[PDB]
C-alpha cells in the first residue's frame, strides 16, 4: 500500500468496549456520609451519552467497597480482544486518591491496577479511560475576575 | 541502546484519568442538574465526539466548567466558588471515537 501513519488508537474493532458506570448515591448510615442528590441525573446522562458512542454500558448503583473491587476484578478478567477501549465512570464521595463505596473507601490505584498492561492482556495497547466525579480534598477555589 | 525496547510498553501506559476537579479540591454537584463536570462532559461529547480528538473535547469541558459555573450558597464559606477539572493523560496516541 501507500505511506502509513500510526498516530491514533485503532477504534474500529467490532465493539467500542465496555462503559462501567458506578453510581453511589446512598451510603451506609455508619459511615456518616450524605446522600449524593442529583447523581442519578449524572448516571442517566452518561448512560445515554456513551450509548450514542456505541459503548456497552453497564450501570451499577450503590456498591460497597467489596462490590466495587469484585466488579473491577471480574471486568478486568473478561476477554476484551474484540473491544477497542475500556471506560469506567466513578460517581461517589472521595478524597485525594480515594473513591468511596457505600460502606468505606477504595484506593483508586487498587481499581486501576486491575487494568495494568501486565494484568489485563486483552487491553494492552488500548485506551483505558477513568472518569472520576468525586472530591479530591477540601480546598475551595475562590476564582479571580477576568 | 536497546532497539528491542519497543517490544515492551510501560504497564501504566494508555490510561487517561478525567478528574472532575484539581488535586486537593472539592468537586461541585448540583442536586437538580447533576455535577458540573458530568453535565459539561456529556454536553461536549454529544457536540464534538464526531469532530474532535478526545483531549480537545476534554479541554472544551475544562473551559465550560471553568467559565459557566459558580456556586451559590447561604454559607459564606461555600459561596461564589469555582472549579477546574484535571485531565491526566498517559495515552500514547490520539483518541477519536469515530473511525473511517
Amino acid at each position: 500500500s501507500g505511506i502509513s501513519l500510526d498516530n491514533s488508537y485503532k477504534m474500529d474493532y467490532p465493539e467500542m468496549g465496555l462503559c462501567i458506570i458506578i453510581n453511589n448515591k446512598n451510603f451506609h448510615k455508619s459511615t456518616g456520609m450524605t446522600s449524593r442528590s442529583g447523581t442519578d441525573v449524572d448516571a442517566a446522562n452518561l448512560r445515554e451519552t456513551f450509548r450514542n458512542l456505541k459503548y456497552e454500558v453497564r450501570n451499577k448503583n450503590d456498591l460497597t467497597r467489596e462490590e466495587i473491587v469484585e466488579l473491577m476484578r471480574d471486568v478486568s478478567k473478561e476477554d476484551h480482544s474484540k473491544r477497542s477501549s475500556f471506560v469506567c465512570v466513578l460517581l461517589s464521595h472521595g478524597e485525594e486518591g480515594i473513591i468511596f463505596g457505600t460502606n468505606g473507601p477504595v484506593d483508586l490505584k487498587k481499581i486501576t491496577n486491575f487494568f495494568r498492561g501486565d494484568r489485563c492482556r486483552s487491553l494492552v495497547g488500548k485506551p483505558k479511560l477513568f472518569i472520576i466525579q468525586a472530591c479530591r480534598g477540601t480546598e475551595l477555589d475562590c476564582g479571580i475576575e477576568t | 541502546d536497546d532497539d528491542m525496547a519497543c517490544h515492551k510498553i510501560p504497564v501504566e501506559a494508555d490510561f487517561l484519568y478525567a478528574y472532575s476537579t484539581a488535586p486537593g479540591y472539592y468537586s461541585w454537584r448540583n442536586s437538580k442538574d447533576g455535577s458540573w463536570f458530568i453535565q459539561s462532559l456529556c454536553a461536549m461529547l454529544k457536540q464534538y465526539a464526531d469532530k474532535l480528538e478526545f483531549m480537545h473535547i476534554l479541554t472544551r469541558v475544562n473551559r465550560k466548567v471553568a467559565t459557566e459555573f459558580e456556586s451559590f450558597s447561604f454559607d459564606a464559606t461555600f459561596h461564589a466558588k469555582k472549579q477546574i477539572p484535571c485531565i491526566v493523560s498517559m495515552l500514547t496516541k490520539e483518541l477519536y471515537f469515530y473511525h473511517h
Binding site: 468525586a134 472530591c135 | 461541585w28
Partner: peptide, 4 residues
C-alpha cells in the same frame, strides 16, 4: 450546589 453541594460538594462531594
Amino acid at each position: 450546589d453541594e460538594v462531594d
